[PDB]
């Protein structure tokens, strides 16, 4: 009856940023101490809380989002940001109350020769609403001309692969990120710490 973080932060399989991944946690406990005594993360900022004095802070249920993004895009995962990622892959709300945890995983997410399994939505007609998930693969239509499956002028496939390759400068390496989302509506809050 502990909150199953161990299967989110240590999961061998992360999803692409565009198809970011979510796990709702409820009915358990949580040791937010161990997460920031591990001290193995590169970036760990928390907005609208404070990791230490959060073990007494109970919440109805907490969400844990995970994906993978270029090292210099982790600045886009913050409340009030814009860019390729925050605008078309995962947008954080202005009034955000949670934590953003990232840790360079180039020793696993950029195999020899280039890892092309991780993608990032590149073309979109308007921006994401907070915690929105766009999975559409339909051919992006830049012009008046309906594409209907044909790549070509004014016709672009929206999802572009990262060129993950380990020799690249750190900025262009894979950084596994897992955003923690704490919410509390008027209902039995069951995600307490000790």
């Amino acid at each position, epitope marked *: 009856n502990l909150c199953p973080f161990g299967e989110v932060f240590n999961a061998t399989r992360f999803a692409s940023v565009y198809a970011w991944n979510r796990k709702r946690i409820s009915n358990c406990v949580a040791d937010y101490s161990v997460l920031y005594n591990s001290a193995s993360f590169s970036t760990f900022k928390c907005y609208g809380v404070s990791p230490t004095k959060l073990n007494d802070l109970c919440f109805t249920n907490v969400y844990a989002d995970s994906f993978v993004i270029r090292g210099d895009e982790v600045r886009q995962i913050a409340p009030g940001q814009t860019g390729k990622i925050a605008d078309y892959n995962y947008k954080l709300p202005d009034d955000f109350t949670g934590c953003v945890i990232a840790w360079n995983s180039n020793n696993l997410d950029s195999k020899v020769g280039g890892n092309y399994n991780y993608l990032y939505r*590149l073309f979109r007609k308007s921006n994401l609403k907070p915690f929105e998930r766009d999975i559409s693969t339909e051919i992006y239509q*830049a012009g008046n001309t309906p594409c209907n499956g044909v790549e070509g002028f004014n016709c672009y496939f929206p999802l572009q692969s990262y060129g993950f*390759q380990p*020799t690249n400068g750190v900025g262009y390496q894979p950084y596994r990120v897992v955003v923690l989302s704490f919410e509390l509506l008027h209902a039995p809050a069951t995600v307490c710490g000790p």
Partner: antibody
Amino acid sequence: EVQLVESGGGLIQPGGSLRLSCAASGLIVSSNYMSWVRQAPGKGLEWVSVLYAGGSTDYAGSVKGRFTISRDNSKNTLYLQMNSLRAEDTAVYYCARDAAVYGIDVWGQGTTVTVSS
Amino acid sequence: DIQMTQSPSSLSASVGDRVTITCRASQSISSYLNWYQQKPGKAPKLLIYAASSLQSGVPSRFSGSGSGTDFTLTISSLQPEDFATYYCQQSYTTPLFTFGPGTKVDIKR
């Protein structure tokens, strides 16, 4: 009739304002990465600023807070307002649709910005 | 950021020659850069996108290769309408592109 005819820009003192116009036709500027790239006589191609489909913008440190990319999606036109102009800005300005990986395929005709007092 | 760099600052070539221009980027841009042609007074012209996909409306004699960090444009038979400067661009940070110094192909003599 895929073409981008840019206009608005000739000569103006160091500090004055001049708005540029890119009249898209064939594509839509409302759903495209619309960039401006500047180029001097004895220099290469330098990116100046960007406007996404989601309306988000971004400009190079030597511009930030002096120019301001715009667009009117009722006239299918891309704009660029240039305030507190200086001598470093003297160069030809091209508007072009960045097709991401597919590359900058469509390019504006041409517009010169000689700037000096 | 990513640094781009052309090889011969300006090479010399004849009509019917087979020219080869180079371009290498700071990181391992994996197959994500196109090639451009510019004649004085005109706008750039796209030639190759995504390393080696030929642009429609572009002669058959324009090649394209490179995939990792060191790329290369190669024209089969230089025709007179091909004397111009050719630049390369990186579409890795796609919204925020950069170019190379360009390589000016003139007439050998």
